[PDB]
Amino acid sequence: MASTDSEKVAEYLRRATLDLRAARQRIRELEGEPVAVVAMACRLPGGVSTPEEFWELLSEGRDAVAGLPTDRGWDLDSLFHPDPTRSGTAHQRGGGFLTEATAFDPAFFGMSPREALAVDPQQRLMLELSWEVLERAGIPPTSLQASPTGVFVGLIPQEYGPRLAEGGEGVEGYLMTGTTTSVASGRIAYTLGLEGPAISVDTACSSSLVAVHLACQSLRRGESSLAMAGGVTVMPTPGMLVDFSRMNSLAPDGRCKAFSAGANGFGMAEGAGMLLLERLSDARRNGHPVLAVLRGTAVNSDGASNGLSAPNGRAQVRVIQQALAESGLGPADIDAVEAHGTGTRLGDPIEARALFEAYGRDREQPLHLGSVKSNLGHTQAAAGVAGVIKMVLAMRAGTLPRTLHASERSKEIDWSSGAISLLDEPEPWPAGARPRRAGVSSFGISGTNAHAIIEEAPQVVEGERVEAGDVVAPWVLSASSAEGLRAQAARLAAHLREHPGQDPRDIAYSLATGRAALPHRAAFAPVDESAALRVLDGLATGNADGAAVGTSRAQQRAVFVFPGQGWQWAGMAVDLLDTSPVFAAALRECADALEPHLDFEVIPFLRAEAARREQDAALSTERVDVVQPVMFAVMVSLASMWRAHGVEPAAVIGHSQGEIAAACVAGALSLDDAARVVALRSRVIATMPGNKGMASIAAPAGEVRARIGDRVEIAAVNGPRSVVVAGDSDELDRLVASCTTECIRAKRLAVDYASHSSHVETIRDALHAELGEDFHPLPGFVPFFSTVTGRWTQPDELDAGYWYRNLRRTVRFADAVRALAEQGYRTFLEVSAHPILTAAIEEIGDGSGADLSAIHSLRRGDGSLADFGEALSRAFAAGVAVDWESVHLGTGARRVPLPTYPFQRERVWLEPLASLPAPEREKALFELVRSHAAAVLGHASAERVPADQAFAELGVDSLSALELRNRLGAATGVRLPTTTVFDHPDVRTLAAHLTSELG
């Protein structure tokens, strides 16, 4: 038996206890799971645009209260009259106001300038903040697509445009979509694609802190795995200073003299703040950087106070005490509170009495009482997420900043206790045995008081290892505009010239995993931080030096094309193998797959360079029985290297023997299968040579069709002006003599046999004998394009006959690449050691459809890991969707704070028929459609609206799309379908269709 009830009722007790230990840590994660503050974006009064430039305002004691905005078309003359009760006048003669809420980047997001004109400056800045708070957490803002990620913005209605009843001229249907705190949380969750609860909060001076409360509990419960809490009060009208002044509450200076005897009113400021909140478990499991940790947030109302405006004492204590209880802390656990400190001669006394009650009553050390509004002004609904950022910087800098205008501690408050030390000098706040905790209070004008507790981030980040590597990881940067590309290279040179010594692998991991892939890319593989800040000083002007630049919208899947003979050099793979674990492993694998059939092990033949490959009656890998197996060894290893750094194929195109690598990498044949196949095709092809030869020439193919003869006929169409012809020595040498005198140079390939002709079938006997049926054709892993039928086909036809057939008929490489272009793909990596025929598919793209992208791996006499970092550079820059979590899968790379996107801001402020002559008609309708587009898009500068950008990324929503189709149905007088904007996503496509609808 089981030791009756001694080893049983005690075996059920280690479950009923170990289930109680896991059903009680679910209750401590449903109520008090500490949420992280993964990133912080802020646009605050003064020059503040980053949470780092705010620490240069909070640490050197600068007040951002400068003056009223002149950008915004505010009267500024009726706002000020000696009569303090004149309707329409304001009482504060300044305040910390944003100098950049007037400007915005519309084309960056899916917004038309006309729609971005109607967008409230509250949401317009929240869009740029939502991007910053994601680019600052190392989260690509486009990777958060269809993801559970709440957006909790806290705003105030205010008044921006023209009263909706009267509408507008260009802003007619978008006026509503601009003046609505409703879409001021949904607009953000639409542009980024977030599928989390996007709620807007209205509690006035507590909106932000109440929004972090709602976000904290959407992470405690789990409704959203990520949240962007945050509040904005950009005031586009002086209405608030005119109505906050009729109650006589604004400070005549606009300064929030927090807890000071000279408080002559509450003052004001405009601003915005956003926090990326994630529960600590998820934040540290996914690797997201934790700055500080929101532990407990409480939200209460003042109740029946002395009016709707006047604060309440007991209610404030009940939320400063509910936050501590809900976080599991005590009054003595908090080291520095960041009180509201609104600035009113009434609010501050009751507020401090509340802080002397919830903390000061039981204090061991004096509470460091502060207020961000002293340095900034009352940012209203941005106050609370300005205070959480000032506390999260105070912890992240080990200093608590000063509360400006607090030298004369208020006489109406009893500071005799000493339990509260008003921060008038920067008091050091160092990391120690106690976790550094703080508390941020926002008490709104609506009566709802909120108090949040912010612990320091648990210092478990330490423990990182160190190392060095030869991988020159591409520093990939990208922007939505060519000028944003030259300013994302200038704001990084500055960050790497003003934040010096940041490991180059750490700036390549952060720019790659943490920056969205935007449709203007630049990529360079640095070897130093002066060959990078010289490239980041040429990419700032536009000069592509040592880098790769490319406009690559609508490009996400690459194809692998496989060149034949041409890299006779074959002395660049040594370099890659020596520096690449993967190229020194895949090459070994394919060689040891080749040796069982062809004894030649490639690696010794590989250290042998061509400088060491011409003594014993030899040339630059002219032995077919030796070049073809080692060619394959290099090709499959290069294709495995490219797939090892994250680039996977979409289609496959193999010129002559690249078919065999089509077999291998696309899964249709194994390494042994394809190795045997090429090795066996090799020996057979090595018995014919001595009488045939291939002759690549740009020679007109509709002209060498008559030259077909003397046994020399076309073996491959490698582009429009690219023809590989194959035959014996009859026309072979006379081609060169009778051609090169008329600017047509015959590149007589250094080969000795003929393929894709009737010469291959002379070894049909041995080709079908020495291939065997053992490399059974298998449905593989990648689509593939046959260069014998010239068709996208199945991967189940690659057998012995298939190799014969491929070596029998014309390759038609040109037809294959054009079928690629028309099929849906547009980018092709010439996997090879030297990209021969590079400008051949570029030739294909120049005379047909759109120009194609010729990315290539190595070159003749270029095989270093530096040239492979440049290969990945030109691949990213040309559109190829490299995965950068594989190139940096392990290199000792850690996230580094980097400059966010350089939004190219322009002032967007809302104040209260052709008789078929020629293709000249094509470009004339093209221009007509563009002009009617950049008149329903509100592009006052009709000049240009990107031709490669879609009708869903230029803000061509209903209104724009419908009026556009109506403008075209009147100017061209046509009947465009209702869903035309969806039928033709591009202005190029729309213009082509309209000029094609002539009859």
Partner: antibody, heavy 118, light 114 residues
Framework: EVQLVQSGGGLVQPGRSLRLSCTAS????????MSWVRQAPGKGLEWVGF??????????EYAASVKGRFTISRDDSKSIAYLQMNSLKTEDTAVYYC?????????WGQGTLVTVSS | DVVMTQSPLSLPVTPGEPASISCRSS???????????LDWYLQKPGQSPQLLIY???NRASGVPDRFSGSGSGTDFTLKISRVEAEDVGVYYC??????????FGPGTKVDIKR
């Protein structure tokens, strides 16, 4: 977090020996008497045996089908449970699994397709 | 003697519909403690067996709220209040009163119902 990853399956003949190892990481190995159960292909689970906790002492209770053939051990300092299978026969073609308990099989291994065919 | 436990061996379940596997023991599984010594295990198809319920009614952490347990040692009833594609497989009624236990029982062969 608890896990009971196994190792030691393979192909042998009736009358041979074989080792079954149960790597326990996540819990204090010495606390739970661990069992070894067996799923013959496509039929119900049959319990092979179990070794009692070292703290409890006790003994090693095996089945009637495998007494005198299989022996089960455990080590804390190396934290592995053993099913030593000896004198195998055609019946042992099955997916032996190692569960953390002797009366309450709370956690399980993925199962080792130990096969005994001639 | 030994406790012989039987069940509705071939119980069909249709998704979204509450189902109920039952167990019937020859002897009494309610031990002095006031605790039944019956356990409910799940071997989802081709996976490691899972512990759904211990001591008759208690549910094992990680097992969804769906698997409830109600009844007495003799006549038990595992009650799935919501059968999805995860509430399928073989449900073993496995006693604990007498251990040597050569078998886990025939097990309830659960199937998606049409």
């Amino acid at each position: 977090e608890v896990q009971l990853v196994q190792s030691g399956g393979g192909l042998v003949q009736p009358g041979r020996s074989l080792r079954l190892s149960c790597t326990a990481s996540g819990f204090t190995f010495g606390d739970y008497a661990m069992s070894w159960v067996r799923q013959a292909p496509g039929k119900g689970l049959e319990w092979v045996g179990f070794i009692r906790s070292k703290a409890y002492g006790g003994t090693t209770e095996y089945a009637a089908s495998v007494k005198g053939r299989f022996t089960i051990s455990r080590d804390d300092s190396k934290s592995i449970a053993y099913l030593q299978m000896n004198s195998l026969k055609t019946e042992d073609t099955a997916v032996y699994y190692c569960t953390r308990g002797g009366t309450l099989f709370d956690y399980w291994g993925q199962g080792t397709l130990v096969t005994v065919s001639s | 003697d030994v406790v012989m436990t039987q069940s509705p061996l071939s119980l069909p379940v249709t998704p979204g519909e509450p189902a109920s596997i039952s167990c019937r023991s020859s002897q009494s599984l309610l031990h002095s403690n006031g605790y039944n010594y019956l356990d409910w295990y799940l071997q989802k198809p081709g996976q490691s067996p899972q512990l759904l319920i211990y001591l008759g009614s208690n549910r094992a952490s990680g097992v969804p709220d769906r698997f409830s347990g109600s009844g007495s040692g003799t006549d038990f009833t595992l009650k799935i209040s919501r059968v999805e594609a995860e509430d399928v497989g073989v449900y073993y009624c496995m006693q604990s009163l007498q251990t040597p236990r050569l078998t886990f029982g025939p097990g309830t062969k659960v199937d998606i119902k049409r």
